Amino acid sequence: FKHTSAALERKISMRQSREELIKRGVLKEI
């Protein structure tokens, strides 16, 4: 409930754009 918030904050900080993930083939609509 707070013991993971630092790590998570760090990960979300460098979150990639949806568009970038769609470009690299990871993100696809159903």
Next chain:
Amino acid sequence: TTALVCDNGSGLVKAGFAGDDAPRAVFPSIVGSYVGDEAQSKRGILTLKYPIEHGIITNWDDMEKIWHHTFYNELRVAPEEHPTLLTEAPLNPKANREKMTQIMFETFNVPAMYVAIQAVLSLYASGRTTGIVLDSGDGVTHNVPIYEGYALPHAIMRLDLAGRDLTDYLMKILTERGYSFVTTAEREIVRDIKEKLCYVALDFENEMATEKSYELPDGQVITIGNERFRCPETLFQPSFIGMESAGIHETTYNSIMKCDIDIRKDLYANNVMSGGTTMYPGIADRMQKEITALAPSTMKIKIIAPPERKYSVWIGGSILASLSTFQQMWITKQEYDEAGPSIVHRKCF
């Protein structure tokens, strides 16, 4: 100054304040003029309905009653004074998202608002942004692979059975044992039996080849044997209730196999479980075993199933709402005044 977090489930509402270690309000998602506990305890006058079915809001008037009750009666807050983070099921129709947003801004006058996919929140609660979530509640089950906070819609698997179907199935098999559980009240009794005595066998055939007493309100002491593990086995073998679908282990594998080859390793190593129906003793070890049997030996499998996992979705929301990186993500009353309900698709992803 303090964000509200609400996880609206098919069976239970979980609501509270960001920063807490658990939703301070947990109550039945039912409306009778009467909501939740008040609604049940007065079963004899009103007609009780569930406004959410299989994770999707289907009765909007009653849902509005749920939210109103949540703000005013349970949390005792004024909606206008708190940013509010809500949850939604994987594959929730767009129109539903917009309607949720519209209600929050126009009916409840929230200063700010956000909607997150349940499974993404439980992943977040574990401090991860990539992994695959098995989220199972009262109404629906999903495998949801996630890469950098984005659920991958093409790889999401839905299993159309969850806790309520498990309870119904235990009613059935206990009835075959000679007892009789048929009515709604009896269904509640059986749900209690399920939560107290059921578990997942590591090896189902071996377990079958190999018991507890439960006292009913009327004073009768019944005995439960293989039912204890036969009930949740349905998760792994849906044909027990006549479903043609593959079990949760197989669908975890299939979901992973629908994903980009180079993220698969990361999904196998980060398998999160969340929701009330993942609370069975032995379920984490059984999934570990089944996934290991399905996967290549070149793979590290890890199942993250913390003790508080029943509430991981809510907990995820609570963590997320308090992060600095998230504050620019809130939909403000201004942005909604400038774009209407459709701002939700742009802002909440």
